Design a protein around this nucleic acid. Structure first.
Ligand code: MG
Ligand code: MG
Ligand code: ZN
Ligand code: ZN
Lengths: 49, 1362
RNA sequence: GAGUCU
């Protein structure tokens, strides 16, 4: 009865970069940071897989 | 070109014109259409020279046909265009302008010399007020300022009777009129009567200047410039951008402002304009000259177009982007490249993969040289095209040049010398550098995209220097610590680990093999596991008393895999070395053993073979990482629910108001931190001994072959700490503050963190990565400070003939001995003849190396402490002797003459600071302190031996300690210290001093999160200066009403009770004071800030009761970041905020008079009847109880020691040991290995200078601090020839000051403070004779150390002979 | 100014 509100989605504390990391829940924050940063550096290939 | 030294002085107006080759009288540059030098412009050809080589402007005289011809038409000398960067110019300023560096650079120089305030001088410069230059009748005083109104007074009354003027002219005439000889005498003779501190300091500095001003040949006139020199054009170039746009230096823009205002001033003087107009122009001239020289110093810097300020001359000299730090103590280099590095696990340790096309561009001149020799190319242009076409013949010749021609490989950051290593190049197919895995530790190079720089040693000397010094195979041990840096990691450790370790039966258990080769036969044949227990015949060679190896054959019970590894093992090592299951720590000992037994060659081949087999058997193993490999204990949810209930209990007691906020904070962290230990011990117990296997007998168990376990147990990568986060519990996370978050993460990475657990984890993630970016530079700045002080120091002499050294007791600290005597004393000349216990036969000679052999004999006889020759005690003036330093830790043998120790020392200290700032920061997620030291448990039986302890017995019947620095020893049967602890203040001892204890006994017990104040007398409690609201506060509860009192400090205190000290006074039943047994001290314990008190006024107490409880909140996890500032402060020799007081002279104490609480000590020694008096603060409870035989350097106030007080009272060896122990304790907390000798090196540089007390027989006389080396060279001739002996005192210096105190001003201006160094050197007329390394690095000469050592001393005999 | 190795 004391509850007033609730988080809308499971994803809301995270960014767009970090939302695309699978199993982010099991990654240390420190490596997750670089992963989302390097995901941005990923050159697109000849065949989009 | 070659020369002896460089000298600095002020430029005379006359001297400025000598450098000039014409006056620039116009601010014009170039004609916009016909782009040429303008008529007497800033880029004039008539003044600075022609734009093309040997070509006048008009073009009448071309080429060398006209050699030294000055064209009559345009007026231009037919010379090289080289002359345009070399010839300078000048500007005849119509009016004098002050030189900002001899005005603003404090001390003011012009003001310090005039004894006239800078404010007063500036008023004269900007024409606010007149200054009297020479008041004819002394009605008007000299150097007295007159306002514009006050000038008008004297003008009507006196007129010519006084000469007061205004502007730079007035300060220059003021500097002209002053006599240096007459004023200097007067200052000497009138210092006699007063003699204070700051008068005698400033009046003596004025004498030093006046005398040095005379001896320098400088005039005070020249502080003000009448002539302004111009920089040569090519040094401030107007060149064309490819497009039509041009570009120019910011100096051209500042020169133009100066010339415009100077030419206009000449015009307004020509026009005899009113003075109001003329003054504005003279202010603007001062502003433009001051902006030219140093832009941002006098006022707001003049900005150009970009909004940024114009870069001045001073700016191209001063600091980081100045010539010194960027284009002179460091350079861009020919025959260099780089690329992304990648493994070469096939390579040998002396090799590296160098790409084809890289090596082709690198070695171009050597190919053109071979192509002409073999007769393939006629000329170089022809050879260039052969190489550009990449002909088949060229690859063969390239291949020829590179054989036996080494290449240097470098990584950023270059923290220590091993950051550069030489290899033999191997040409490879791809574009990526291949690096040898074993040298990866020195570079700190991982292959996740590191890049490395390539350099070609061109000259033969450089080929030999590369191969003899900097080759990878010569550089195995660390110069910081005598241990190998070349040590297998990762796959290699895991592979030898998998090989050696055994397993129950397995395939083919208890078999019997002919040799190590039949073991490889059964494994490759597929009949035995590497883990089968087997008897094998192995023949070990062990080395005899002489050089010869003795062969011994024996049946050995080992696994198949262990037999196979013996094949790698060279002959000379026992088989005992490969009989255990090998981890990283053991494999490092194998190469260290092998290095000391066999030599360099065997180790290099052994190290390689270990690498090869380690990788290959790691690959065989197929070791892997699955989610099931991360075993969680079944009892995790059990541990957490118990530990949750314990923490809920303190928070429920907090809501009641029983336990406070700070108490709960420390108390809750202890419960969670022991719960993390509980889950982790459960995890490692259900992980390590989890394999329960059936043998051919029935059933037993062994260590688990869980893949992750093997990886952390072998030490290949990860540790038990990391496995907690994986399988166990993540633990307490750190706040970005450093203080620990009260809610820890219960979960692990296998189970997954939830939304909040992640959010909490990110606090610690960001703060770690933050220190990797920011705090690295405080650490790297230490490296730099350390290097600049030790730079110049080199091994000069073989043996100094000094008898002295530092006594090294073993670091036995905190139960387990932290550093043996053996480790601390190894590779060091025995100072004194140090024999065995029974003093009836010498064991070790005085001037002799400590080899591992002699160090083992020290343990046999149990040598306790050993006096050892140190760098600090060396009596070499020039540098250090080889003996005092000892063994080169990197080489394992006596240090060579010529080796640069200063730099090696700085680097070893600096590097681990710097690299550890990046290490457990990227890798750090969590916090892991465990500072809950409740109770000492003694482990061996012993007699209890306390020292520096004064306890008092309490009502309970317990020995309570009332001394701060109490130590607890553990004395064995014969009577020697095994274990050592710190027993703190207000601690309860189980057994007092001398009593026997058993092993595993709590010998001491106390409360960690509180520092009690305990009494020494019994009776009642009195409240003194404890007024409510001013000094203390109060808070109460309900029905009955329990109130606690909380003492406010100066932060939470009003101005009313500032000079009131709050203290709990002891009294008896009557109401009178209670004397502390055997002393005239009425009992009074001073309570400090934040001190919580539960006993209120009028409460009966016994001796040993706790009066007040001072909070002890320190929940920061101490990483490199929290301890490094301590290191910096120690090396910089800072007194703390509260230095502990020490006795200056040995003798009988008598306490004296008092100043409203503040104590005096009129101590009158037995021999020295003359007294020494010193004031003491009120609140300092003293350790000494007066009237007692106190010696030099006895702790009177408890508290931290100034290193200054240590050196002053207890000599050099005392202060050296304070610095080494205090600094080294900080690196020992982090597990960093730095030999004591490296700290000793820098401490020697700190103990460089010395103040001369008694008069000499030169010109030291009194107060003048000079270097130690110099005063001793005088004392050598004085002790023999005679005359007045010079009494002395050695002084301590911080790094940053000792670096600036060096006589080489080029060393000083290259370190920091460039603006100040140059001006103080210019005024003294100092001459730098280029002594140290910095100086010769600057001039681009051979280092006067290392390989050039030989060469520099050969020039020095040419100088002596005639 | 946006990055890469520490
Ligand atoms: Mg790494
Ligand atoms: Mg890397
Ligand atoms: Zn001409
Ligand atoms: Zn010496």
């Amino acid at each position: 009865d004391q509850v007033d509100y609730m988080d809308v989605s499971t994803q809301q504390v995270v960014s767009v970069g970090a939302s695309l990391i699978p199993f982010l829940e099991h990654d240390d924050a420190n490596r997750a940071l670089m992963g989302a940063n390097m995901q941005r550096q990923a050159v697109p290939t000849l065949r989009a897989d | 070109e070659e020369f002896d030294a460089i000298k600095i002085a002020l430029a005379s107006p006359d001297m400025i014109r000598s450098w000039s080759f014409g006056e620039v009288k116009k601010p014009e540059t170039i004609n916009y259409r016909t782009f040429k030098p303008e008529r007497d412009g800033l880029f004039c050809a008539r003044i600075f020279g022609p734009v093309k080589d040997y070509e006048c402007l008009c073009g009448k005289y071309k080429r060398l046909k006209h050699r030294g011809v000055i064209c009559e038409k345009c007026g231009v000398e037919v010379t090289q265009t080289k002359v345009r960067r070399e010839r300078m110019g000048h500007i005849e300023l119509a009016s004098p302008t002050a030189h900002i560096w001899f005005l603003k650079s404090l001390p003011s120089r012009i003001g310090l010399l005039l004894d006239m305030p800078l404010r007063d001088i500036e008023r004269v410069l900007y024409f606010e007020s007149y200054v009297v230059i020479e008041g004819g009748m002394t009605n008007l005083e000299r150097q007295q300022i007159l306002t514009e109104e006050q000038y008008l007074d004297a003008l009507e009354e006196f007129g010519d009777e006084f000469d007061a003027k205004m502007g730079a002219e007035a300060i220059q005439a003021l500097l002209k009129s002053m006599d240096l000889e007459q004023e200097c005498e007067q200052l000497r003779e009138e210092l006699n009567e007063t003699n204070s501190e700051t008068k005698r300091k400033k009046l003596t500095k004025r004498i030093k200047l006046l005398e040095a001003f005379v001896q320098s040949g400088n005039k005070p006139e020249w502080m003000i410039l009448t002539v302004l020199p111009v920089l040569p054009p090519d040094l401030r170039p107007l060149v064309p951008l490819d497009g039509g746009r041009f570009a120019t230096s910011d100096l051209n823009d500042l020169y133009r402002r100066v010339i415009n205002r100077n030419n206009r001033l000449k015009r307004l003087l020509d026009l005899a304009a009113p003075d109001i107009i003329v003054r504005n122009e003279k202010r603007m001239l001062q502003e433009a000259v001051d902006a030219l020289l140093d832009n941002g110093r006098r006022g707001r810097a003049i900005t150009g177009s970009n909004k940024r300020p114009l870069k001045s001359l001073a700016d191209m000299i001063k600091g980081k982007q100045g010539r010194f730090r960027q284009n002179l103590l460091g350079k861009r280099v020919d025959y260099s490249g780089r690329s992304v590095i990648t493994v070469g696990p096939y390579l040998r340790l002396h090799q590296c993969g160098l790409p084809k096309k890289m090596a082709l561009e690198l070695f171009k001149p050597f190919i053109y040289g071979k192509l002409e020799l073999r007769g393939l190319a006629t000329t170089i242009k022809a050879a260039k095209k052969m190489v550009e076409r990449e002909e088949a013949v060229v690859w063969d010749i390239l291949d020829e040049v590179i054989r036996e021609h080494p290449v240097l490989l470098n990584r950023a950051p270059t923290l220590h010398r091993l950051g550069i290593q030489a290899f033999e190049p191997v040409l490879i197919e791809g574009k990526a550098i291949q690096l040898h895995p074993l040298v990866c530790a020195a570079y700190n190079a991982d292959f996740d995209g590191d890049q490395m720089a390539v350099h070609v040693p061109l000259t033969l000397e450089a080929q030999l220097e590369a191969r003899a010094l900097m080759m990878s195979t010569n550089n195995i041990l660390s110069p910081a610590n005598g241990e190998p840096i070349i040590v297998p990691s990762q796959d290699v450790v895991l592979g030898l680990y998998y090989m050696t370790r055994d397993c129950v039966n397995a395939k083919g258990e208890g078999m019997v093999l002919t040799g190590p080769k039949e073991a490889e036969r059964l494994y490759r044949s597929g009949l035995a596991s590497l883990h089968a227990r087997v008897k094998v015949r192995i023949t070990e060679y062990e080395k005899d008393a002489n050089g010869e190896l003795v062969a011994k054959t024996s049946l050995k019970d080992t696994t198949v895999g262990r037999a196979i590894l013996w094949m790698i093992v060279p002959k000379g090592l026992p088989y005992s070395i490969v009989n255990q299951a090998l981890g990283k720590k053991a494999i490092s000992k194998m190469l260290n053993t092998c290095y000391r037994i066999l030599g360099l060659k065997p180790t290099v081949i052994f190290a390689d073979q270990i690498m090869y087999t380690g990788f290959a058997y790691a690959a065989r193993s197929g070791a892997s990482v699955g989610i099931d490999d991360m075993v969680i204990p079944e009892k995790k949810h059990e541990i957490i629910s118990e530990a949750e209930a314990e923490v809920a209990e303190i928070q429920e007691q907090f809501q009641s108001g029983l336990v406070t906020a700070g108490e709960r904070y420390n108390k809750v962290i202890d419960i969670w931190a022991a719960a993390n230990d509980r889950v982790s011990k459960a995890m490692m117990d259900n992980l390590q001994t989890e394999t329960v296997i059936n043998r051919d007998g029935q059933e037993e168990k062994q260590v688990s072959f869980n893949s992750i376990y093997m990886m952390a147990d072998s030490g290949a990568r990860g540790s038990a700490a990391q496995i907690r986060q994986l399988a166990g519990m993540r633990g307490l996370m750190a706040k970005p503050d450093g203080s620990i978050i009260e809610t820890p993460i219960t979960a692990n990475f296998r189970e997954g963190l939830n939304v909040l657990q992640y959010f909490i984890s990110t606090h610690g993630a960001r703060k770690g990565l933050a220190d990797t970016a920011l705090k690295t530079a405080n650490s790297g700045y230490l490296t730099r400070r350390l290097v600049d002080v030790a730079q110049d120091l080199v091994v000069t002499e073989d043996d100094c003939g000094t008898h002295e050294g530092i006594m090294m007791t073993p670091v036995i600290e905190g139960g387990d001995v932290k550093e043996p005597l053996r480790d601390r004393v190894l590779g060091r000349v025995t100072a004194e003849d140090v024999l065995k216990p029974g003093t009836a036969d010498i064991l070790v000679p005085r001037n002799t190396l400590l080899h591992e052999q002699w160090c083992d004999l020290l343990e046999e006889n149990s040598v306790d402490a050993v006096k050892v020759r140190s760098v600090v005690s060396c009596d070499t003036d020039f540098g250090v002797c080889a003996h005092c330093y000892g063994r080169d830790l990197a080489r394992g043998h006596i240090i060579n003459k010529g080796e640069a120790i200063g730099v090696i020392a700085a680097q070893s200290i600096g590097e681990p600071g710097t690299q550890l700032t990046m290490r457990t920061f990227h890798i750090g997620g969590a916090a892991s302190r465990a500072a809950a030291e409740s109770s000492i448990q003694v482990k061996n039986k012993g007699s209890i031996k306390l020292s520096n302890v004064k306890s008092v017995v309490n009502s309970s019947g317990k020995l309570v300690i009332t001394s701060r620095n109490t130590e607890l020893k553990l004395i064995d049967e014969f009577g020697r210290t095994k274990e050592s602890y710190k027993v703190p203040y207000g601690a309860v001892l189980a057994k007092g001093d001398g009593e026997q204890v058993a092993g595993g006994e709590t010998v001491a017990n106390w409360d960690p999160h509180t520092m009690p104040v305990i009494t020494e007398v019994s009776g009642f409690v009195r409240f003194t200066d404890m007024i409510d609201g001013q000094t203390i506060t109060r808070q109460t509860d309900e029905l009955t009403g329990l109130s606690s009192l909380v003492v406010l400090d100066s932060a939470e205190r009003t101005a009313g009770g500032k000079d009131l000290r709050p203290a709990l006074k002891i009294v008896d039943a009557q109401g009178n004071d209670v004397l502390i047994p055997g002393t005239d001290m009425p009992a009074q314990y001073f309570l400090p800030g934040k001190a919580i008190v539960q006993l209120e006024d009028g409460v009966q107490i016994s001796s040993g009761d706790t009066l007040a409880r001072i909070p002890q909140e320190s929940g920061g996890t101490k990483d490199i970041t929290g301890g490094l500032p301590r290191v910096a402060d120690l090396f910089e020799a800072r007194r703390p905020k509260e230095p502990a007081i020490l006795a200056e002279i040995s003798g009988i104490v008598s306490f004296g008079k008092e100043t409203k609480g503040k104590r005096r000590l009129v101590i009158t020694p037995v021999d020295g009847s003359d007294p020494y008096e010193e004031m003491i603060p009120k609140w300092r409870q003293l350790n000494v109880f007066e009237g007692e035989r106190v010696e030099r350097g006895d702790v009177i106030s408890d508290g931290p020691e100034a290193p200054h007080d240590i050196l002053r009272l207890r000599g050099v060896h005392a202060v050296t040991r304070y610095i080494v122990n205090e600094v080294q304790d900080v690196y020992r907390l982090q597990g960093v290995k730095i030999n004591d000798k490296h700290i000793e090196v820098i401490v020697r540089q700190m103990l460089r200078k010395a103040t001369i007390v008694n008069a000499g027989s030169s010109d030291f006389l009194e107060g003048e601090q000079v270097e130690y080396s110099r005063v001793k060279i005088a004392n050598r001739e004085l002790e023999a020839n005679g005359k007045v002996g010079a009494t002395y005192s050695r002084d301590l210096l911080g790094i940053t000051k000792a670096s600036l105190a060096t006589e080489s001003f080029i060393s000083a201006a290259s370190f920091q403070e460039t603006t100040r160094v140059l001006t103080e050197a210019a005024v003294a007329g100092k001459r730098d004779e280029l002594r140290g390394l910095k100086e010769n690095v600057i001039v681009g000469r051979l280092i006067p150390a290392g390989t050039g050592y030989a060469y520099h001393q050969d020039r020095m005999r040419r100088r002596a002979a005639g």
